[PDB]
From a paper:
[name] neutralizes Omicron subvariants with little reduction in activity. We also determined a crystal structure of [name] in complex with Omicron BA. RBD that exhibited the same binding mode as with wild-type [name]-[name]-2 RBD. Comparison of the interactions of [name] with wild-type and BA.2 variant showed that the salt bridge formed by [name] VH E55 and RBD-R408 was eliminated by the R408S mutation in BA.2, which may contribute to some loss of binding affinity. In addition, mutations at S371, S373, and S375 in the Omicron subvariants induce a localized conformational change in the main chain of a loop containing these residues in the RBD. In contrast, other antibodies such as [name], identified in this study, and SA55 are largely resistant to mutations observed in the Omicron subvariants.
Residue numbers in the entry:
A (entry chain H): 1 to 135, 141 to 222
B (entry chain E): 333 to 527
C (entry chain L): 1 to 211
The structure:
């Protein structure tokens, strides 16, 4: 089937550069007009750039013209986006997509899975895990996963055995440039003395894995 | 008032076909190139032989504005020492070209639902065009040994073909408006200057 | 630049109901009007092109119509998998533009949130910062107001909010609000309160503690 795979993203400081790559399989890439589209976290879709089938015609969004350059290698089914002079406003998931007009599909019918691009001056840092201790009938407890960078972290409870009543919230970007997250669970109050509750936090970018037991204060 | 009519060329409602490209001769006026730095969508602003900023500080005997419409992928052919259908059969620039090529996407203006068939290009010609040559012949191209006698058929093709621009066409096949400014400084006093 | 406006921003419907989503263009769309669907954590999926043509493999309960500056995406009967974000998009005018999107969520009966307040842990206090957490559990609709009060003074600018996706089992939402301050600032005050306003509450509910 049609497959588009993007790579070459990650974390970069403001003013840095990246070279995004998209590999295409399952269709005639050399006869396909290609686009880069981007989506900032919590935002909608925004068009970035277009290149024609032969590579002779390109167009750019105003916010990236003069800094981004789109190109293609038809012999290798390769689409490329060179991003220079990156700013924090360029932080987004970047999708590579095909405008399938040659097959009478006048829209972006094939999309990649997207590649994350984070432009920030913050440094990679593992999280600190603090307990939110419980204090009618149903009690609430949780873990606060604070001051980590970059995204993401994964949270489980009791090594994945406890999922009912578990809410792991989307992270929020703090003014310091580091992320903070909370994960909570509601349990019967009677179990607060007999059942153990441990939250497991995994932060792959810092190679960090923390287990925190939560008990009443 | 003493200003060269660049707006009549750039802001024209309709553009000529590339095979019948339009030429405007401009002389005896004060040329303000600043108004030509305005339009953002410029796909090409390639100047050969002169810097864009020095144009406002230079004097030329004449300037020529050649305007036409092509497809996007052919915009690269409007340059010195190029080959292809447009460069060889429709519009050719000299190897020693001194001037600026400006090109911008015009899918909004020149494409219609069902196809704009008014824009044509020459597909067949006996030989390459000389620089700044305009060939408007509709004579049947004899690609075989049998003379055509003006009859189109096998080995006898009409030399002109239509772009048929449609708004849903890919950006490489969408219409692009091109203006070529040639600055002529020959054995005569200069009459076009920037101020 | 063609600006695409989508109405409404959020649509609450029950499964089996029909859905109508509007896309309005600031000027005539000369090229193609397309509709895409997107789910959290996934790439967009093409639903409609040419404003009426259905993409290959897309169920026939999706249809599109319109022209010029007015377009409509219709879902005849909503399946559970149809509750997502929907975008319109135009091709032919540059730059290529998208609408801001319309979110379809599941309508259910009103549920008042359960409110919990967590004071900062001593371990975090040792680090020099204090985070007070307010949790609003299992409420509908999504709209809820959280007001932080420190010694009866309303707090603005030092709190951050996060909301989960609609729960697959009970179609509720949950909200976490974090009020962050320095340890010195935390020790300067005594009463910390979280006041919650929601449609399912007759009057705002306050959960508080003394430092
Ligand atoms: C001519 O200039 C006017 C300026 O008011 C502009 O609105 C119009 O679109 C221009 N026409 C063309 C064909 O560029």
């Amino acid at each position: 089937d049609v497959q588009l795979v993007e790579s070459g993203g990650g974390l970069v400081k403001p003013g840095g550069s990246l070279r995004l790559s998209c590999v295409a399989s399952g269709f005639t890439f050399s006869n396909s007009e290609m686009h880069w589209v981007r989506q900032a976290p919590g935002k909608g879709l925004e068009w970035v750039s277009v290149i024609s089938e032969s590579g002779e015609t390109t167009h750019y969004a105003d916010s990236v013209k003069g800094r981004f350059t789109i190109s293609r290698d038809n012999a290798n089914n390769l689409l490329l986006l060179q991003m220079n002079s990156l700013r924090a406003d360029d932080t987004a998931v970047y999708y590579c997509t095909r405008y399938n007009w040659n097959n009478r599909v006048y829209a972006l019918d094939s999309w990649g899975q997207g590649v994350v691009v984070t432009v920030s001056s913050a440094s990679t840092k593992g999280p600190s895990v603090f307990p939110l201790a419980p204090s009618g009938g149903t009690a609430a407890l949780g873990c606060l996963v604070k001051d980590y960078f970059p995204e993401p972290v994964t949270v489980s409870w009791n090594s994945g055995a406890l999922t009912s009543g578990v809410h792991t919230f989307p992270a929020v970007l703090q003014s310091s440039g580091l992320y903070s997250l909370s994960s909570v669970v509601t349990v019967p109050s009677s179990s607060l003395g007999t059942q153990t509750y441990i939250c497991n936090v995994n932060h792959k970018p810092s190679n960090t894995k923390v287990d925190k037991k939560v008990e009443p204060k | 008032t003493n200003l060269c009519p660049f707006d009549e060329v750039f802001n024209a409602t309709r553009f000529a076909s590339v095979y019948a490209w339009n030429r405007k001769r401009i002389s005896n006026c004060v040329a303000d190139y600043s108004v030509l730095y305005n339009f953002a969508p410029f796909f090409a602003f390639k100047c050969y032989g002169v810097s864009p900023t020095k144009l406002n500080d230079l004097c030329f005997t004449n300037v020529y504005a050649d305007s036409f419409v092509i497809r996007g992928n052919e915009v690269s052919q409007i340059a010195p020492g190029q080959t292809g259908n447009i460069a060889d059969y429709n519009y050719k620039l000299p190897d020693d070209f001194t001037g600026c090529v400006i090109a911008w996407n015009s899918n909004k203006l020149d494409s219609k639902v069902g196809g704009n068939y008014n824009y044509l290009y020459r597909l067949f010609r006996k030989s390459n065009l000389k620089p700044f040559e305009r060939d408007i012949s509709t004579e049947i191209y004899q690609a075989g040994n049998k003379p055509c006698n003006g009859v189109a058929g096998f080995n006898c093709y009409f030399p002109l073909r239509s772009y048929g621009f449609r708004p849903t066409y890919g950006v490489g096949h969408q219409p692009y408006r091109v203006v070529v400014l040639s600055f002529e400084l020959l054995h005569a006093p200069a009459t076009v200057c920037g101020p | 630049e063609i600006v695409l406006t989508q109405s409404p921003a959020t649509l609450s419907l029950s499964p089996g109901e029909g859905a109508s989503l509007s896309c309005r263009a600031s000027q005539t769309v000369i090229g193609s009007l397309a509709w895409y669907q997107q789910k959290p954590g996934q790439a967009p999926r093409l639903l409609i092109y040419g404003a009426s043509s259905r993409a290959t493999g897309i169920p026939d309960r999706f249809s599109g119509s319109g022209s010029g500056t007015d377009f409509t995406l219709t879902i005849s009967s909503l399946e559970p998998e149809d509750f997502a974000v929907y975008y319109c998009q135009q091709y032919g005018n540059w730059p290529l533009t998208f609408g801001p999107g319309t979110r379809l969520d599941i309508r259910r009966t009103v549920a008042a949130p359960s409110v919990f307040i967590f004071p900062p842990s001593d371990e975090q206090l040792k680090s020099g910062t204090a985070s007070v957490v307010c949790l609003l559990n299992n409420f509908y609709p999504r709209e809820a107001k959280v007001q932080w009060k420190v010694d009866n003074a309303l707090q603005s600018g030092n709190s951050q909010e996060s909301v989960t996706e609609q729960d697959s089992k009970d179609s509720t939402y949950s909200l976490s609000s974090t009020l962050t301050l320095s340890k010195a600032d935390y020790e300067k005050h005594k009463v910390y309160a979280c006041e919650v306003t929601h449609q399912g509450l007759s009057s705002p509910v306050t959960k508080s503690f003394n430092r």
